Amino acid sequence: QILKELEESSFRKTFEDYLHNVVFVPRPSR
C-alpha cells in the first residue's frame, strides 16, 4: 500500500515545479 502514496505526493509536488519554472524566466531579458 506504500508506493502508491509515494508517487502522487511527489508527483503532485512534481506538478508544481514546472509551473514555477515558467515564472522566473521572463524576468531578465536585459
Partner 1 sequence: FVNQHLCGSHLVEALYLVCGERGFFYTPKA
Partner 2 sequence: GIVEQCCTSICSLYQLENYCN
Partner 3 sequence: HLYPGEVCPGMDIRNNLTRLHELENCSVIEGHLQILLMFKTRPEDFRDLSFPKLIMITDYLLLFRVYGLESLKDLFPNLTVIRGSRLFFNYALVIFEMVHLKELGLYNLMNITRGSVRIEKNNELCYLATIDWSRILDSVEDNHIVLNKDDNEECGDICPGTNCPATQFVERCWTHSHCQKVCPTICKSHGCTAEGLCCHSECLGNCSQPDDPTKCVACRNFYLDGRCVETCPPPYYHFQDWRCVNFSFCQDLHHKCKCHQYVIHNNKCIPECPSGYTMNSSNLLCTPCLPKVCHLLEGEKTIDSVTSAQELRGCTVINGSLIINIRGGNNLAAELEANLGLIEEISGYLKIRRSYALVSLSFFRKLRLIRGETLEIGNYSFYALDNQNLRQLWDWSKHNLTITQGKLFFHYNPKLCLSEIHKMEEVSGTKGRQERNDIALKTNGDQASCENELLKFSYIRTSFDKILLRWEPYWPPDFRDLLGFMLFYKEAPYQNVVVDIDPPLRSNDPKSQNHPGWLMRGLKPWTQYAIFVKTLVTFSDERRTYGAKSDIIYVQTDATNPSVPLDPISVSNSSSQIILKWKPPSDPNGNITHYLVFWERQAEEEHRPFEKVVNKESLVISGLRHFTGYRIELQACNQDTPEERCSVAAYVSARTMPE
Residue ranges binding partner 1 (CB under 8 A):
16, 20, 23-24, 26-27, 29
- Give yes or no for residue 25 binding partner 3 (CB under 8 A): no
CA 25 → CA 11, 13, 17, distances in Å? Answer: 23, 20, 13
Helix (H) or strand (E) holding 22: helix 3-24
Distance CA 6, CA 14 (A): 12
- Give yes or no for residue 30 binding partner 3 (CB under 8 A): no
| In the complex, minimum distance from the CB of residue 7 to partner 3, in angstroms, rounded to a whole number | 6
- Positions touching partner 3 (CB under 8 A) are 7, 9-15, 18-19
